[PDB]
Design a protein around this nucleic acid. Structure first.
Ligand SMILES: Nc1c(C(=O)NCc2ccc(F)cc2F)c(=O)n(O)c2ncc(CCS(=O)(=O)c3ccccc3)cc12
Ligand SMILES: Nc1c(C(=O)NCc2ccc(F)cc2F)c(=O)n(O)c2ncc(CCS(=O)(=O)c3ccccc3)cc12
Ligand SMILES: [Mg+2]
Ligand SMILES: [Mg+2]
Ligand SMILES: [Mg+2]
Ligand SMILES: [Mg+2]
Ligand SMILES: [Zn+2]
Ligand SMILES: [Zn+2]
Ligand SMILES: [Zn+2]
Ligand SMILES: [Zn+2]
Lengths: 65, 48, 262, 262, 240, 65, 240, 48
DNA sequence: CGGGAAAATCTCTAGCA
DNA sequence: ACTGCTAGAGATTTTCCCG
DNA sequence: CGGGAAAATCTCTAGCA
DNA sequence: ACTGCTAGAGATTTTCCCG
């Protein structure tokens, strides 16, 4: 369970707010629902809509991690 | 209650006022002369 | 300045002054002159200076027909990744669009298709192919191509790459597929330094893996949270915050304020 | 990675990869992949993401012909103030433009006129009227209306005001002059909270008054400055800086570094 | 502090508020109140319109009577429609407030009356000497143009910007620009006075003084027809 | 002379730099030439081209000054 | 610090670097070097192409042999022009590296050879069972479509996303997405290894160790075929 | 010496390379095939 | 800690009918 | 009830690399 | 000094063929 | 060697007004 939580926290999320057209950086994924995505960006827990988020696992993880 | 003045379809003339039925992020749903129209918020102005 | 309101109104019915002109000429406060402007129906001629934000889900695709050299190219883009699929079609009918869309849905997990209100996409033929493949159809607001701002942008980029490889091929369809190759695999940059094909594989694999991981997390982490109230689904127990979901509302709570039972 | 340079070149001659794709695929540093892209003539397809800045002098005017209701409106704007002068003309010839321009130069101190390359403005008739009135003719870069971005913007605004007063008049020329009235005197806002007529009166009076004040200052303040060298015209002696002019170069100098003689 | 020196130089010289607000670094409302409390002391919008006749054509001439700045057009007919078009053009070009015409059939038309009503121009019922000078310049430059209206606009150019005179040696365009800048300053001072004529200040608590200036740290008021400067926290301003 | 210097410093200048499209605020005019304008904005002496400057005397000087 | 535990679990179990880089929070170059120094241990781009015949029409079928993901088109003729068009479409859609064909006249054409040369596809000279399953699904869904190519694309949809099986119960589309994501990770690790295979590190000063990882405060090197972690200032990295 | 690639007149095709004769704030003067052209800097790219 | 240098990020534009 | 975006070109900030 | 409130400024967009 | 701008609509910051 805790290993699966740390596994799902390895994914990066690129998100946007409602009136800012630029994409915010790689937030840490905390929870994924069907319509909402709970992330941690800039040590702030945020709730993004599912339509406003691109969740990847950046495969330049072969250096960092 | 709100007044919406809008720009609709291939027409630079502005119509309105209409009744605001829905205000979403990005677009609005309005009702002018018993006609329901979906207008982007760039082509609409809402006054309270 | 109550006489100034009447005089500013009867000159706004002639000149249609803005609020600063009436506030200067008739000594009105700015709220009163703004109310004189805002009551004139002839002066509401400008919209809100913003832009919307298209649906960047992993299942949404944006389709559009573009034209080049007297031929019609039906283009689709994956909005989350930028992965394109284009094809030169003989005509811009819906019978030829439904074949492209059924083929695309057979290739990739297409969940939603966002088009404009072109007859090709608005037809009953594309409506039956989407019902068969299980695709949801979204249409943009008419005469507003900004709603399709991804695919139109990709239209530009597609034509740009065709202009670089038009002499490497004899027919336009070969150059279109060569440009699809170059965009999907030979142009890097974006959110992960990826090409569009690497980004769509990463996005779809991430969606599958995160759905499996969350389905395995929420069946084992079966807790309830009382904050401030009532029971709530625990979504994420952190060290300084707790994310819950009650009344279909995902809400973040300070760690001082909640406690988790069960 | 010297073999990677040759392989990245021979794949850029096929695919025209950007620099990030070649730097990822062939392990090149970014400067080398950027040099492979920058040597391809087929890949220079984008210009500099900036804009220029038009001449905002007190003497420059920007002229343009716009069209409304099948009629031609010749519009001029004072670029420094926004003051417009428009007139419905019977035809878009240069004989009718030179009359408008000679009339405008008789009304206001017109020193320079910036137009596009319309035949009206490019003619020998407007060239003789400008020679008589002493006006300098500047023409924008062809098929680039951004060079006339003031007057074109005013074109928009002029038509906007005509759309608010089209029913107050019977003919278009009356509504055009009514809109010129409303823009020049009934629309406030800008750099001083002014209307366009107040701003042009302020700008021309300021130009006259500052030219007189500087002509009276520099005939009495006849000093010379040695800084760091050589003699230089003292322009402004301040407390912490000294502004001079030597070799036709206006230069600011620290107060520690210069000393003023004579 | 310089209010006192300005009051002594006004009781000595009867200076305008322009001189007192510049020689003593005063706000213009304070110097305006100094010159307004003195009992000893108790036009830019006027144009004049006429029609001349030359070579069988009719020329509408408008003269700014304060500066001599002319504005002339060859009109196709001496009709109230053409006169109303000329007046609307002139009102859109310059701040016109009153025209003085000569009881002509084209000046007392309903079309000119509606044009003056729309632009806010008073119509009342120098000019002949200006028409004489304009006809002299038209006769001077008639050889340089093919048509008459070109020669009329050339003469308007030469009169407004090439003929100098008066006391300072300025042209008519410089004179109308200075006169209308002075009128803008006058209207801005009247707006600034009307903005604070509805206030009453209670200071030190003595009576309702009238506010003249509200600065960054001090207010300037007038009580018992004499002016004093009070600190900001030692005053209460009530809009009444 | 010094009164004329303080007179010419009462004029305000709205200027622009070469790659910033927005107009900077009311700088104090120090010197005016045929092609250059020496101003004082933000306690910094600057030299603007004549084509990049709008010099006014803001006639809402009837309040401040 | 977890390099030692990973080396002991590899000498016990012969684990892949995927397991060692995840069970011990290692960089993948370090676990790759652990599994590469072990002497005991010393395909995603392959497609297979065929032409089937049904109702007098010819169907080009490409099968990803690692996942079973098919891609089929009714072509108007069994011509190398149509085959080259199919291959260029497939190469633009998926990362194709090798096709396996059956020495046909349309597969050994010069047009297909030029298409494979342009897209960088090796051409070498499962598939029949996949054609049998695809023909079974086409016969299942032939009643739902008017034309054959619609039924072929419907069967490609049903095979790639509606038929599940194998060990995990995944469809062919999920399998090809996981396989190609694994290939992207493999190519990224090879790029990361090739980026630092040209470096030599002098540490503590002992000999030229090879660099495995250069972190924020420490470097990881391998000297004398054993791995050690060194501080950043106690190492000198020379590109040679 | 510089290479200028430009976009000239009612034509989306990019021409070049040309010799940079003058680089001003806002526009450039270039020489392509003994033809001197003034191009705005939005429609031109200069490489050293 | 301190300069260069290189990478990363920010700003901004055309073209998409 | 729906919605501008994308990639390149410079400019500026930020991080790295050794002393 | 501290909150509201109002003014000022910043951001951003259409239309100019 | 020449050149996007302008005004309005919201949003955010900044200054004022009295305690
Ligand atoms: N105008 C179209 C553009 C376009 O303008 N691109 C330039 C542009 C400008 C700005 C921007 F942000 C992006 C952008 F691309 C376009 O790209 N596409 O694909 C279109 N496809 C089809 C139709 C006709 C719709 S209809 O007549 O059939 C109808 C409408 C409503 C109801 C019924 C029928 C028009 C367009
Ligand atoms: N296109 C013209 C626009 C225009 O597009 N406005 C929209 C626009 C878009 C963007 C922007 F920033 C501002 C902007 F206004 C325009 O406003 N005006 O006044 C024009 N006047 C005349 C001619 C034809 C020149 S020519 O054919 O006679 C020739 C050219 C060269 C050499 C010889 C002859 C074209 C135009
Ligand atoms: Mg379309
Ligand atoms: Mg389109
Ligand atoms: Mg023009
Ligand atoms: Mg124009
Ligand atoms: Zn109005
Ligand atoms: Zn290239
Ligand atoms: Zn007196
Ligand atoms: Zn092993």
């Amino acid at each position: 369970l805790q290993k699966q939580i740390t596994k799902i926290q390895n994914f990066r999320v690129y998100y946007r707010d409602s009136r800012d057209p630029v994409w915010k950086g790689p937030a840490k994924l905390l929870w994924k629902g069907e319509g909402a995505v709970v992330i941690q960006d800039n040590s702030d827990i945020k709730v993004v809509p599912r339509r406003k988020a691109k969740i990847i696992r950046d495969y330049g993880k072969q250096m960092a991690g | 209650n709100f007044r919406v003045y809008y720009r609709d379809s291939r027409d630079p003339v502005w119509k309105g006022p209409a009744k605001l039925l829905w205000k979403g992020e990005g677009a609005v749903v309005i009702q002018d002369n018993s006609d329901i129209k979906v207008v982007p918020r760039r082509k609409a102005k809402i006054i309270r | 300045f109550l006489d100034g309101i009447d005089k500013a109104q009867e000159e706004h019915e002639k000149y249609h002054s803005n609020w600063r002109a009436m506030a200067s000429d008739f000594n009105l406060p700015p709220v009163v002159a703004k109310e004189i402007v805002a009551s004139c129906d002839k002066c509401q001629l400008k919209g809100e200076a913003m832009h919307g934000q298209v649906d960047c889900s992993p299942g949404i695709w944006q389709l559009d027909c573009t034209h080049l050299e007297g031929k019609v190219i039906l283009v689709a883009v994956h909005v989350a990744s930028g992965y394109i699929e284009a094809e030169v079609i003989p005509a811009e009918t819906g019978q030829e669009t439904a074949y492209f869309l059924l083929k695309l849905a057979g290739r990739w997990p297409v969940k939603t298709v966002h088009t404009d209100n072109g007859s090709n996409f608005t037809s009953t033929t594309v409506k039956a192919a989407c019902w068969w493949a299980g695709i949801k159809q979204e249409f943009g607001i008419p005469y507003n191509p900004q709603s399709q701002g991804v695919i139109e942008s990709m239209n530009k980029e597609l034509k740009k790459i065709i202009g670089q490889v038009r002499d490497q091929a004899e027919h336009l369809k070969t150059a279109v597929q060569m440009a699809v190759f170059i965009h999907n695999f030979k142009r890097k940059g974006g959110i992960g330094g990826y090409s569009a094909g690497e980004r769509i594989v990463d996005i779809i694999a991430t969606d599958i893996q995160t759905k499996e991981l969350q389905k395995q997390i929420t069946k084992i982490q079966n807790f309830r949270v009382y904050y401030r109230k009532g029971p709530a689904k625990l979504l994420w127990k952190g060290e300084g915050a707790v994310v819950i979901q009650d009344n279909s509302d995902i809400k973040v709570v300070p760690r001082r304020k909640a406690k988790i039972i069960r």
